[PDB]
Amino acid sequence: GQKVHPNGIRLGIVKPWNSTWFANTKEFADNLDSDFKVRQYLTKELAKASVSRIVIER
Amino acid sequence: PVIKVRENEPFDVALRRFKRSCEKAGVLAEVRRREFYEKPTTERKRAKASAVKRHAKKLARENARRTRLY
Amino acid sequence: AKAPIRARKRVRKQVSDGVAHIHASFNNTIVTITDRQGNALGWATAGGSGFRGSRKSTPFAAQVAAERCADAVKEYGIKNLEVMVKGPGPGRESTIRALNAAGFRITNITDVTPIPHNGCRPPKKRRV
Amino acid sequence: HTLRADIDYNTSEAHTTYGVIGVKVWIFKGEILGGMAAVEQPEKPAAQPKKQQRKGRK
Amino acid sequence: PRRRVIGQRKILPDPKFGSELLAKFVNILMVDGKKSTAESIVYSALETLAQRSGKSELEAFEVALENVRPTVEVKSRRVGGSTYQVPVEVRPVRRNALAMRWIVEAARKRGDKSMALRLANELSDAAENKGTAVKKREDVHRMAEANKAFAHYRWLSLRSFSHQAGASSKQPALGYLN
RNA sequence: CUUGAGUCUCGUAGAGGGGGGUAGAAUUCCAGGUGUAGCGGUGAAAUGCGUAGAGAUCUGGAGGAAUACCGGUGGCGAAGGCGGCCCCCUGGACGAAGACUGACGCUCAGGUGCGAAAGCGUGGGGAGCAAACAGGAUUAGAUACCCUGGUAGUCCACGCCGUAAACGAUGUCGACUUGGAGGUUGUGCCCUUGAGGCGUGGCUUCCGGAGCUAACGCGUUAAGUCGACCGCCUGGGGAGUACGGCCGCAAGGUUAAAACUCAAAUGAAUUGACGGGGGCCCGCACAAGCGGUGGAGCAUGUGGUUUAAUUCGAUGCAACGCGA
RNA sequence: GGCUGUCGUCAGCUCGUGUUGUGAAAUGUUGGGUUAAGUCCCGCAACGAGCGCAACCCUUAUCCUUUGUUGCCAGCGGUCCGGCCGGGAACUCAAAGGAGACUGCCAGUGAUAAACUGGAGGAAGGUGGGGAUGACGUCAAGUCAUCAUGGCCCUUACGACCAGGGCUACACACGUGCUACAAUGGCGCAUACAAAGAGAAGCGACCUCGCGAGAGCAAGCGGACCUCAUAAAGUGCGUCGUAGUCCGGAUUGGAGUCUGCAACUCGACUCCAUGAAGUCGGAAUCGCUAGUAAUCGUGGAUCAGAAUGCCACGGUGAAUACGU
RNA sequence: UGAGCCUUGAUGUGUAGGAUAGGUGGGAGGCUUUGAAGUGUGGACGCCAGUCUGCAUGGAGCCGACCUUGAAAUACCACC
C-alpha cells in the first residue's frame, strides 16, 4: 500500500488548500485548533444535508 | 586430440576445424564415462538432429520477406 | 635434486635434432625431451609448478613445463624439434609455443594419441 | 504522480453492523482546470505608471 | 548491465598554479576533503625538490609519474567453486592515478618532520627508480604475467567461444566466454 | 473363376543366423635401452604408487577380451536384438520378365523352437574395469555417494527356469483413404543440368489435409475407415508378494489374490517458483574504486542480565539516532 | 476501516473487446533495434486504451525582465573606505513572470529509426543540474497506542488527584553516529569570508559586575536595520618526532554558574589542576556515479533543563564506471 | 667405499652492519704491471649468480688497524 497521498503534493498549484488564513507563528496553533473545532461541530449540525467540502478563511 | 591430420601451413595454434573428419567423435570423446552397447546409434549419430535448427532458420527467412520485417 | 651451478657453457654430444613427447592427463602435463632414436635427454612437469587442483592442468602450466625441459637440453645441443602428442587434455597449442620460444622449429605436430580397436573398459564414474 | 490541475480523491469512513467499512475513490475531470488559476499580472506591468526611482537624492 | 554509455568528470586547473596535471595530483593528496591543504602540501614539497635540482621544480615529480607507473593490472571476478585471477592491460587514467596514489601512500609513512619534506623525499627517490613504489610496480606486473592460466567457468566456455568466432584456446580476460 | 494367396528360374540391398580363417593399436606383461624426483586424484583433499630409483619414454616379443572404421533420416532381426575383413553352410525380405497353379484363405488357446542384460553348471579363457570388501574423503548418511586400493563378475563354447519400461508399451494379416518431397535402392525413360527429373515398385523420413485424441501427437508404415480371429485391463495402498497348478542341479522363475484400510490415486496442460538444463536483461547487483561502522573513547538504541519495577512498539532483507 | 513498508525505479502491470482451445487460460504483457520509457522505427490476433516510467510541476543555474530597500556601489564625497551617511545605478543582489535544450539542427553510428556520441553558441547540450516522483498487489508485513470501530470486559475500575522511584540499571555483547588514533596536524601569537533560518509569549547592542558561564539594567526590534554569531575547517609565522606525544584529551577532585519547592541515584554550563584509553583494530560490516561520496562548521524543528541525532544550509570537495 | 693419518683450497649473502661473522693466534695491511678494479677469458665456490680472484691492457682496489655497525669484527696468512 504505496504512495505519498495523491492530492497532498498538488496543494501549492491549481488545487486550493482546504483552509486559508495567517497568524504570525506564535498564534498559528491557537488558530489551527479553532479552525478544526469549527470543522468538527458545524458539520454535526448539517448532518441531514449533502456536502462535498468545507473551506474556512479568516 | 591435436588430431593427426596436418593443418594447411604449420603454426603454433592447431586449425582444429580443418583437421577433424571423424576423429575423437564417439571413440575418445566419452573419456571416463560409462560405455553403452546400443545407445550410441541414437545418442551420438545426431547429424539429421542438428540440421533442423538450420532449416527452421532458412524457413523463417522467407516468412520475414512476406511479413515486411525484411 | 638441483644444485646452485655457475653460468652454463657446457657441451655434451651436440646432437642437433630431437623428438618431444607430451603426455597430457586431467591433473598434469608430463613433457619429456628425447633423442630421435628415443632416449630421455630430460623432462619437466606441470605438477612441480605446485598450483594444486584443476589449476595445474591449464595451458600456461603446459607452456612453462615445455620451457623448463627445452631449456635444459640446450646443453645436449638440440637446434630443431618434432613432437608427438598423447592425451585429450588442455595446452593443445600453448606447449607448442614454448618449444618454438626455446628458439626451435616445430613443423611436425603429429598427434599419436592412441585409439585402440575398442580396448579395455573405462571406470563408469557418474551415473549420468 | 501529476502535480497540475485539481483532481478529486476521497477516502470514506463509515459504519455498518459488523464494524467500519471504507471506499478509496480517485476521479479525474481534466488535466487543465481553471477553478483555481494564477493571478492576472506579473509584478512588472502592474501598479503605478511612473515606477522608476530617483536613485538617491533624499 | 548498464543500458547506455555513461561519462566521467573533468578536472579544471587548480587555483594557485594553473595546471590540470597538478589539480588531479592534489585531488588524491586530499585527506578529510581538504584539497586547499593538499595544494599547500604540493607547493611546499615542490619547492624543496626545486633546491635539489633548479632546472625545473617539476623535474623529480614528472619522472616519478613515468617510472613507478604500472602498465598492466590483474582483475578479479569469482566463478563458482573458484575465485581465479584474470589479467587485463590497464587504461591510462588509472595508470596515472595508481602511480599518484603510490607516491602519496609511501609519503604519509616517511616519518619526516614535515609532510612537504615527506612527499619531496619520495619523489626524489621514485624519480631515480630507487624508492618505495618500484616494488608496487614490480608486483602488479608479476601477477599480470602469472595469471595468464585462468578462464571463467572454463570447460564449457571453450566450446562457446569456438562457435562465437573465438579461438581454440583460453582467453585470460574479463567477462568473455573463453 | 481370379479378385485372395501360393510356386519356379532371374536380379538386388544389408552389421540376419550358425562353424571356419586373419592383422594390428593403447592398458596389461617379460626382456633390453635411455633417464631424475615426483606421480595420481579432486571443490580442495587424503588413502594409493616412489629414492630399495618411482613417474614418464624408446626398442623387440608376449597374451586375451575386443575390432576402433560402414556411423547416415541407411539396411537387416523376432521386441528387446545385429558393426573389423574374408571363406563355408544357409534364412528372411525388396525388385522384374517369362510362366504356372486357382480360395490351396484369416486368426490362433494349447503348443514346440528361440534371451537385451546380468544369473549360471562343467570346460575354455582373463587384459582392464568393478558389486561387496577395505580404507580415505563427506558429516550428509549406507563399508553407500565421491576417491583410491580390490574380488566374484564381465569373455567364449555347450546347457537350465526365458526376465523388464518385452518399444512405433501402435497384435496379426488383409481391404479402403488429396499428396508433395527427403534418405536411398530394383527398374522404364533423360544431356541421369545438383545425394537431379518424371513412370512404377521397395523400405525409411519431413510437412501437412479428411478422420481420430484429455493433451502432446498420429496421419496413407495411423493413433483414420474397417474386416475377422486372438491376446490383456476393470480404483488407490498393501502385491509382481501371497495362494494353487507347473518348471528349474541350484539361487530362482511362471501366471497371480483377499480380508482390511481408504476417498481417492493416476495421463496431461495453464501460470508462478525452480534447475545443480540452456540463454538473455536490468539496479552501487557485481566489476572499477573510495570512504564509513565493528576495535578505542564517548553518545545513543537494541537485547542479555537485574530489582518494586527498570514499560513497550519494530526483529532476515519489511529492527537497533526508528512509532517513542 | 483509515494509513504506510518490502520488493524496485523491477520495467513491468491492467481495463475495454475479439479471436484460438472443451475449458482452466493464452494472445497483447512475446520478437528484432533502442531507452529513464508500453520511448520510438520494423512486425506477427492481437485490436482499441489506461496505469508505472515519460510530462506538466517547483527549485536551481546562468540569463531575459520589473523593483532599487533593512539591497548594491566602476566613479564621487565624511572616510577606519563599513551604503553608516551627502550621493551614485557600471554592478551583483533579492521575489516574482519565468527564458534556454527538442535527437529539433548539423555530422558519425544505428535497418528508415528511437537513440549514443561528436559539432557549435551558451552557464549547460542529450528528457540542462536537483527534487517531486512509485504499477495490480501477493508478502496475511505492522498500528485497536493518532484516530474510526464491531465483537467485548472493568466502570469504589483495565477511571482520577497527588508523590516518589525507573528505562539514563552493569559482568556484557551487539546495531548506529560522533570524533580520534596525527604532523595533511596540534601548540602559541596574528588572520579571512558564509549561507540560510530564529528572535511577536520572545530576543537584545551599550551598560556596570564577573576568569568565563552568568548577574542585574536596558535603547532597540519585527529582522536584508538590531542579535544569535568569534562559523569552523583553512591561511601566516615560529615550533614539534612515535616517546600514547609536541596527537588525543576521556576520567576524577575542586570551585563559580544555571531551570525549577526540589538537582541523590537520572539535569545543564563555565572553568582550574592532574591526566588514561586508543597508533587505524579479529569475526562482523555499509553508502556512494558527482555538488555525489568524504570532511568541516552553522542555524533551526523539537525546545523547563541537556544533540553525538533529524532537517536544511554554506565552507572545502574524491577514485572511477573497461566489462556483464 | 667407511675410518685413521696427511699435502693445499674455499664459500660463510645474520637481528644491528657498506659487505666478507666456524673457533682463534700471528697481526696492522699487499703499492709487483697502482695488490687492484673494469667490458672480456678462466678459476676457487654457494642460502643460485654471490663472495673472492688469475691476466693482454690497466696507476680505476679487497678492506682492517683507522674511518663505521655489533654480543663477537672483519686485512692477509694459518688452524680446522
From Swiss-Prot, chain A:
It comes from the Bacteria. Keywords: Ribonucleoprotein, Ribosomal protein, RNA-binding, rRNA-binding. GO terms for biological process: cytoplasmic translation; ribosomal small subunit assembly. GO terms for cellular component: cytoplasm; cytosol; cytosolic small ribosomal subunit. One of its GO terms (molecular function) is rRNA binding. Belongs to the universal ribosomal protein uS3 family. Part of the 30S ribosomal subunit. Forms a tight complex with proteins uS10 and uS14. With proteins uS4 and uS5 encircles the mRNA as it enters the ribosome, which may play a role in mRNA helicase processivity. Some nascent polypeptide chains are able to cross-link to this protein in situ. In collided ribosomes contacts ribosome rescue factor SmrB. Binds the lower part of the 30S subunit head. Binds mRNA in the 70S ribosome, positioning it for translation. This is Small ribosomal subunit protein uS3. The gene is rpsC.
Swiss-Prot record, chain B:
Residues 45-58 have a biased composition (Basic residues). It holds the Pfam family Ribosomal_S21. InterPro entries: Ribosomal_bS21 (IPR001911), Ribosomal_bS21_CS (IPR018278), Ribosomal_bS21_sf (IPR038380). Belongs to the bacterial ribosomal protein bS21 family. PANTHER family: MITOCHONDRIAL 28S RIBOSOMAL PROTEIN S21, SMALL RIBOSOMAL SUBUNIT PROTEIN BS21. Part of the 30S ribosomal subunit. In stalled ribosomes contacts ribosome rescue factor SmrB. This is Small ribosomal subunit protein bS21. It comes from Escherichia coli (strain K12). The lineage of its organism: Bacteria, Pseudomonadati, Pseudomonadota, Gammaproteobacteria, Enterobacterales.
Swiss-Prot record, chain C:
Transmembrane segments: none annotated. Coiled coil: none annotated. The modification N-methylalanine is found at A1. Keywords: Methylation, Ribonucleoprotein, Ribosomal protein, RNA-binding, rRNA-binding. InterPro entries: Ribosomal_uS11, Ribosomal_uS11_bac-type, Ribosomal_uS11_CS, Ribosomal_uS11_sf. One of its GO terms (cellular component) is cytosol. One of its GO terms (biological process) is translation. GO terms for molecular function: small ribosomal subunit rRNA binding; structural constituent of ribosome. Pfam families: Ribosomal_S11. Gene3D superfamilies: Ribosomal protein S11. Belongs to the universal ribosomal protein uS11 family. Located on the platform of the 30S subunit, it bridges several disparate RNA helices of the 16S rRNA. Forms part of the Shine-Dalgarno cleft in the 70S ribosome. Has been predicted to contact the N-terminal domain of IF-3 based on footprint studies; exactly how IF-3 interacts with the 30S subunit is controversial. NCBIfam families: PRK05309.1, uS11_bact. Part of the 30S ribosomal subunit. Interacts with proteins uS7 and bS18. Cross-links to IF-3. In stalled ribosomes contacts ribosome rescue factor SmrB. This is Small ribosomal subunit protein uS11. It comes from Escherichia coli (strain K12).
From Swiss-Prot, chain E:
GO terms for biological process: cytoplasmic translation; negative regulation of translation; ribosomal small subunit assembly; translation. Keywords: Ribonucleoprotein, Ribosomal protein, RNA-binding, rRNA-binding, tRNA-binding. The keyword Plastid does not apply. It comes from the Bacteria. GO terms for molecular function: mRNA binding; rRNA binding; structural constituent of ribosome; tRNA binding. It holds the Pfam family Ribosomal_S7. One of its GO terms (cellular component) is ribosome. The keyword Ribosomal protein applies. InterPro entries: Ribosomal_uS7 (IPR000235), Ribosomal_uS7_bac/org-type (IPR005717), Ribosomal_uS7_CS (IPR020606), Ribosomal_uS7_dom (IPR023798), Ribosomal_uS7_dom_sf (IPR036823). One of the primary rRNA binding proteins, it binds directly to 16S rRNA where it nucleates assembly of the head domain of the 30S subunit. Is located at the subunit interface close to the decoding center, where it has been shown to contact mRNA. Has been shown to contact tRNA in both the P and E sites; it probably blocks exit of the E site tRNA. Protein S7 is also a translational repressor protein; it regulates the expression of the str operon members to different degrees by binding to its mRNA. Belongs to the universal ribosomal protein uS7 family. The strain K12 sequence is shown. Part of the 30S ribosomal subunit. Contacts proteins S9 and S11. Cross-links to IF3 and the P and E site tRNAs. This is Small ribosomal subunit protein uS7. It comes from Escherichia coli (strain K12).
